[PDB]
Amino acid sequence: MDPYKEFGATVELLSFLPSDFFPSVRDLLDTASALYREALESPEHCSPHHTALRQAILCWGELMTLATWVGGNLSRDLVVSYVNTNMGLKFRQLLWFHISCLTFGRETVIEYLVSFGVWIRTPPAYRPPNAPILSTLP
Amino acid sequence: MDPYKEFGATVELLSFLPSDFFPSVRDLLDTASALYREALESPEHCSPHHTALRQAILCWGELMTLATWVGGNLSRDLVVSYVNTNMGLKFRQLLWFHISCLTFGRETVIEYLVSFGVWIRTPPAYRPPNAPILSTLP
Amino acid sequence: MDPYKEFGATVELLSFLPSDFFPSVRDLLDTASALYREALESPEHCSPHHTALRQAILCWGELMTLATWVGGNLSRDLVVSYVNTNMGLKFRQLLWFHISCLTFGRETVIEYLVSFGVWIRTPPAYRPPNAPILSTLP
C-alpha cells in the first residue's frame, strides 16, 4: 500500500518534511522532463523509479484532464484548490522523492530526510541558523 | 509516457479488443487483493508489474476519494459518469493487463490479446464463417 | 493461522465463487460417505484434510442438532433458513474445498479457482460459452 515501501521509505518518515518544502508540481515535471525523459520513454525502465515516475506522470495527466473537464462542467476553482491541497501534495511529494532518489540515490535521500527531520524537530534556540540547503556535493 | 511501452504492449494493442471486454474495476481490485495482496505489501517490488500495480491501486483509491469529494462538493452525477467514461476504462484496462501478466505471464497476455483481436476484427465479406471459440488459459 | 494457511488458499480466494456454484450439503455428505468414509473412521488422519473434514462434519451435525432443538425448544422453524443462509453456506464451501482438495489435489483446486474467477469476471458477451465444467479429468 505504501508507495515508498518498495524503496525502504514510509509515510511515517516523510511526515517530517513539511508540505511547503516540496516544490511546485510544474517545477518537478520540468526537472523530470529535462533530466530523465529519454529514460522514461525508453523501452527498458532500468530502475523501479522510472516505472513509478511513469505511472505518477500518467496519473497526474489524468487528474489534469479531469480538472479541465470539471472546469467545462458548471466551480473549477474550489475543485482545483482541493486537488492541490490533497492530491497535489501527495503527487508533488512522491515526484520529489523519486527525482531525488534518481539524482542522488535512495539511501542518500534517506539520510537527507533524517537530517532534515532532526533539524526541524530542533527548537530554534538549539537549531542551526540554516536548515540543510540540499545540494549535490561536487 | 506510454504505460505499456515498457511491457512491450501499446495502447493501440489493448485497444484492439472492445472496451467493455475488460471486467469491472471492483472485480479486478478483489482479484488483486485475493491473489497478490501480501506480494504488493512486500518491502520489495519483485517485478515492474508489481510496482505499476501499487501505483495503479493508489491512483484509483485517490481518484475515488476525489469522486466522493466532488459528490460532496459542486454536477454530482455527470462527473461520476465521466470518471467511468474515459480514465476509468484506462484503470480497468491497466489493472486487467497487469493482473493477467502477473498470473499467466506477459507474453501469454500479449498472444491472447492479439488472438482475440484477429478473432474479432476481420470482416466476414469473404472471411469463412468458420470462427473458433475465444478462450484464455494459463 | 489462517483457516486455510496450511491449505494455502484464503477465504478471499474462495470469495470469487458465487454461492450458487457450491452444491447442496446433502450432496457433499453423500460424496464424503461414498469416498473417504473409511479413511475418516480411523482416528489416524493420513492428511490434514481428513482432520479438517472430520471436524467440519462433527460441527455440521451439531448444527442440525441445534437447529432441531431450536425448532422444538426456545420463527422456531424459520431459523433453519436463517442458519443455512448464514453459515451453512460457509460450511458447504469448506466441505466442497476439502473434498475437491482430496480428490483432484489442493494446487489443482487452486488453479481451478483462479480460472473460474477469470471466467466469471469476463462479461458474458466475450465470455466462453461454458465455464470450466470441472469433472474428474483423465
Explain the overall architecture:
3 copies of one chain form a homotrimer. With 138 residues, chain A is mainly α. Chain A has 5 helices and no strands. Chain A has helices at 11-14, 25-40, 48-72, 76-103, 106-121. The A-B interface holds A 1, 3, 5-6, 8, 40-45, 48, 50-52, 54-59, 62-63, 65-66, 69-70, 73-75, 78-79, 82-83, 86-87, 90 and B 1-3, 5-6, 8, 40-45, 48, 51-52, 54-59, 62-63, 65-66, 69-70, 73-75, 78-79, 82-83, 86-87, 90. Chains A, B, C: GO terms for molecular function: structural molecule activity. Chains A, B, C: This is Core protein. Chains A, B, C: It comes from Hepatitis B virus (HBV).
How many helices of chain A? 5
Q: Give the helix level of chain A as a range of percent.
A: 55-70%
Radius of gyration of chain A: 17 Å
Order of helices and strands of chain A: HHHHH
Count of beta strands of chain A: 0
Largest chain-chain contact? A-B, 37 and 37 residues
Class computed from helices, strands and strand pairing of chain A: mainly alpha
Strand content of chain A: under 5%
The profile of the biggest β sheet of chain A is: none
> How far apart, in Å, are the first and last alpha carbons of chain A?
36 Å
| Quaternary structure classification | homotrimer
Principal-axis shape of chain A: globular
PDB class: virus like particle
Keywords: HBc, M2e, VLP, virus like particle
Assembly: trimeric
Entry title: Hepatitis B virus core antigen (HBc) with the insertion of four external domains of the influenza A M2 protein (HBc/4M2e) with T=3 topology
